[PDB]
Ligand binder design. Sequence first.
Ligand SMILES: CC(C)=CCC/C(C)=C\CC/C(C)=C/CC/C(C)=C\CC/C(C)=C/CC/C(C)=C/CC/C(C)=C/CC/C(C)=C/CC/C(C)=C/CC1=C(C)C(=O)c2ccccc2C1=O
Ligand code: SF4
Ligand code: SF4
Ligand code: SF4
Ligand code: SF4
Ligand code: FES
Lengths: 125, 220, 165, 406, 183, 187
Amino acid sequence: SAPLRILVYSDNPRTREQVRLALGKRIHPELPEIEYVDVATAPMAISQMDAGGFDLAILDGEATPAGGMGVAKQVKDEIDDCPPILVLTGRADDAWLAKWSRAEAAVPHPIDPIRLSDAVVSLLR
Amino acid sequence: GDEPEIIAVRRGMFGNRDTGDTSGYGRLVRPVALPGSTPRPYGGYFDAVMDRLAEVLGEERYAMSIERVVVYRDQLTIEVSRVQLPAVASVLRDDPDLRFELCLGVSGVHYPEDTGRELHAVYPLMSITHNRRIQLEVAAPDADPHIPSLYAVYPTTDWHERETYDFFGIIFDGHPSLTRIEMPDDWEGHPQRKDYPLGGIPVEYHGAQIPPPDQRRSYS
Amino acid sequence: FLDALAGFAVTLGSMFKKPITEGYPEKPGPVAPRYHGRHQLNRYPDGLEKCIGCELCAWACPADAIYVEGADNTADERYSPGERYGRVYQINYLRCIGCGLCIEACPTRALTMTTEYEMADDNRADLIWGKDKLLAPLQEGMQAPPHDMAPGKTDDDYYLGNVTP
Amino acid sequence: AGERIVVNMGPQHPSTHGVLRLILEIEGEIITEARCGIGYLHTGIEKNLEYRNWTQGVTFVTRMDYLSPFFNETAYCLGVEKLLGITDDIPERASVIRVMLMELNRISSHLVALATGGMELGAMSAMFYGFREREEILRVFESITGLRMNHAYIRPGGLAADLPDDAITQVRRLVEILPKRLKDLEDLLNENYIWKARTVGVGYLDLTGCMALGITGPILRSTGLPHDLRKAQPYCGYENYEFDVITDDRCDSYGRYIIRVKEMHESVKIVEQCLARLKPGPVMISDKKLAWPADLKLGPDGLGNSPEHIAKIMGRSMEGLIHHFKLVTEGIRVPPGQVYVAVESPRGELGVHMVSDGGTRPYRVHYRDPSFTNLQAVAATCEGGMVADAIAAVASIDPVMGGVDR
Amino acid sequence: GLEERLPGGILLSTVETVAGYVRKGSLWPATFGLACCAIEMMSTAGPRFDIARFGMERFSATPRQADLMIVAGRVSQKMAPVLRQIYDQMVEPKWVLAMGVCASSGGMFNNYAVVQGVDHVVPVDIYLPGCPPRPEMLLHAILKLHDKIQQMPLGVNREEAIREAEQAALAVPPTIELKGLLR
Amino acid sequence: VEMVSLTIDDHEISVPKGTLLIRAAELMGIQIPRFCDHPLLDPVGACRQCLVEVEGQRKPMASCTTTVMPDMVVRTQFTSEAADKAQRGVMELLLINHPLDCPICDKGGECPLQNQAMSNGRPETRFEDVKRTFPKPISISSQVLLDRERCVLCARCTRFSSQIAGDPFIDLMERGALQQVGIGQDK
Ligand SMILES: CC(C)=CCC/C(C)=C\CC/C(C)=C/CC/C(C)=C\CC/C(C)=C/CC/C(C)=C/CC/C(C)=C/CC/C(C)=C/CC/C(C)=C/CC1=C(C)C(=O)c2ccccc2C1=O
Ligand code: SF4
Ligand code: SF4
Ligand code: SF4
Ligand code: SF4
Ligand code: FES
């Protein structure tokens, strides 16, 4: 199998750590191994997405210089055959914007490990 | 009716919304009543306005329509019973002695503790000809938040019935199209209802953050 | 009939009058003395911080733009007269609305608002100004804040204004 | 039928103020249907008010209808005072300064309206001259309040602080120069053939239309009806001022523009009257239980509570300290009740429905903003005309979208 | 563009510096404004100040000609899609100035209706405090953006700068962990 | 249970026999200022803040100690000038020696004294003399600091430590203006 590569985007290193903690090397033993590419800045995330080869992108809607929802909209408008996007929302009322970002799934802060894992499995399945 | 309208029951000294910081001060029970029915000799031209409204409306119709009359801070409010709102609005607009042609809008206010009357719609009416003004108040339960739309009588209430709907869910039955005007149509909930959370985020600081004011302690 | 052309006479005239633009940034214009510029944490003449950390400024802020944490003025390290001083004091200038309720709230005048306004950053965090960035510069005759109160003086003396360098 | 496009004037458009969305069905270039799309500048100010005390929600209300800050503040403070039963206890100086600032703000708001309308209609220099006059007005506002916009200077029970010693001289200079400088702006537009051709007969709305939509302000008074909340239902002591309600009979865009231009001069006259009647005295109610305890003063360290007030509260007066602490932290408690208070904002009847539940925070604060109601006239004043006429009609409505959405 | 294919010698450095000088000047703002911050932006364009001195008087009506998007006011939920559409319909290089507290962090309006900073939807280059920022503050922020634009790299230098900025950013702790002196 | 009718101000209610006037006012929604009263502590009537006017009584009656009696007529500060004067004088006397510590006081914002001085106190001080002073704060245990200057000597702490908890290790000490809650010695 091919290590599924997941892009974790957040200016906050602790959000990236939590995302990587919820999703281990294997979300389930039936699923392939997972390799994480951490990106703290929007330019790096966009360039990585352009390089392709990602199975999922987790974008923090609370990212300081460039929010995850904006990056999600940008990638789904700029990359052809871009992978499913999961957005982390800083509040419940952000749900509407999460829908606008066209992200395949939205997980509110604080990141529930189990909710995030279930959403990731659903997106990769 | 005829009793004071309690919109909230405040218990405990110092406006504590919960158990309270200092022991022994929480036993007070002070109902929060809005001003009640005014004694009949209303002030200024309010007496003339009400006499004319009771003359144009039949005694039976007047009693069925006007639920209450309040004169607070030299301002006249008429608690108009739901259902009867279009009739009294037509009478107020058309009656030459009343002639309240200018309706300034509709304002929604939510009283989650006012049983059977949680949602109030306020209609500020002004008569330029007589240089008078009044307010109508129409109450509706949270269970059946329906009010008769005044679109036929006061077209200006259009968008107001919408804003008030968008922010409270009052249905204003009969409105040509009661669609959200402020919030997106996909929006869930009615923001200005007291039960709708403020929806803020913590304010970020170095090493700390301040939750939104709705989460933090308050005294009223 | 020439009235319809009055506008021309306006513009042409202004073309020969000196432009009224302020020369910012080279020659910045004069702001009002009362302008609501950057908050500033002030000191007493001897150098002690005025801020007692009462949090009234933060209390009154409509935008929750001030974070304050008080602490005891232990004899080993005193920063302000009295029992309390504000050891952590942060203003989130991306939430500040310049209303001035904070200064009107202060009971010590520890917080003022200067006329300085030039302030901007490419980073959100950099605009959360801490105690170090807000404290007024140590003037002549002042001493480092961690020092004992002026000899033969008490908090009431500081508030009454009976202290000197 | 199938030969007409449907286009979005959209939020981002020079004449739509960035948040207004006119959806126009154009048959060629004639507006056939004109839907109005609102809420792109919704802010939750009305709900967010409910989580702040009185004297704090002032800072919120001044930011809806931000071109008329003093009008929002005055409406809010009048509502609070009426709920308190304090309207008759406000100091005379505070009321006079309120009238003076409201009229200067009327001049400023009309200047912005004229500037943006001229810019939308191609009158490039109109914007610059209007903003040149508004610059002097805003200098006065900044000196009085320390802010250029969204002032929180008018407070429940009076003002945030007394005028600075130089304020009266600056306002007198304004009274002297505003007519002369407004002469330049009027010369660009008033009698200009293109300006009149571009606005005369455009956006017509009869008095019947104004009543039906509940229009107010210059739009209504362009129909010849001299309705003004300052004469009818006087407030802040406007009854003591000799001024004429400006009204025209054209019922179109040019009539509204002329009404605004003449209202500027009427405001100048009212400000001259205010200066004549301005006398030394307190600017906040004498009741210490409600009076704002802060006493701002300037010093070498900036603006802050005056050293005398610091001495009083921290040195000698326990009652003074308690009052300062509480009135600053929790603020006043307003007896429960409802009050609808209206003022004549530059754009019409700015109404405020204020409900208190007896607590330290406004239970409910709704602004009937005149722009919200006036925008209901876009369909009447745009359908049938060209898009160029729609621009002029909307500009004549002079909608400030902050008040529209709130 | 071919300017991004140039070798990293002195040629690329000079192209970078001249492009930065050219773009810092003639930095046309988009004809875009949400609230009172828009009024202060107009005042900055007004005679008392002169945005024009900086080559920035042409407020591009269409985003195609716009180079800088001064948000200049509060961004509501319903407006964020529109603002993002306007941003995407500008042509690179683009810069976003978050004028005012509302545009930068939501300001005093911390509630459901406001986005809490336009950076939630568009990359922000400079944050400008104030409510509203006085025109001098706007000019200061604009000059700061000019300084940023002048030092903007290109081509291989741009890629190296992106990598270095990423490396630096991955290490910075969050603001919630700067507990300096907090009890 | 026996029930007694009663009139507070102009209003009339019925309450169980043995009820205190302050409790009846609480049930009726009348806010009588109080410091020493505590529902769960036996009434002591010390602070004299809860004074009300009772028909047939020459002196003001401490509502926290006066049991309701049938047909009794009570007028609080809301409807009796004498009662209001008594309460405001008691508040003034309560504040003359109080420290100007509200900004630094932990109880600030949550202080019954602040609230009841706002609602029942003079707007400004008449006290131009020297305030009584103590060394502050002093620890009475590893957990509890005591600021004797802010103490209104309501004895709620001592009355709790005696009645509710059987641990009277604090008590009122000294006499007169020097009286203070204390532990006596290092214990
Ligand atoms: C190929 C090649 C390289 C050849 C070699 C030779 C060579 C180099 C080229 C040859 C020369 C060439 C071709 C040069 C290129 C440049 C060129 C051709 C031209 C471009 C430059 C140019 C056209 C200059 C002049 C343009 C000009 C007159 C500009 C002035 C425009 C003005 C007056 C702008 C001010 C507008 C303004 C006030 C902005 C505010 C906008 C706001 C606030 C928006 C939002 C908003 C609005 C809109 C409200 O009105 C409003 C009203 C009330 C409440 C709220 C609001 C609100 O929110
Ligand atoms: S700045 Fe002033 S109000 Fe804020 S904590 Fe310090 S002394 Fe108190
Ligand atoms: S100016 Fe107003 S918003 Fe800004 S920190 Fe001071 S009180 Fe808070
Ligand atoms: S930051 Fe202040 S001036 Fe700018 S849009 Fe927000 S409230 Fe208005
Ligand atoms: S320490 Fe005891 S006696 Fe003194 S105020 Fe507190 S509870 Fe009352
Ligand atoms: S509470 Fe009754 S005398 Fe103190």
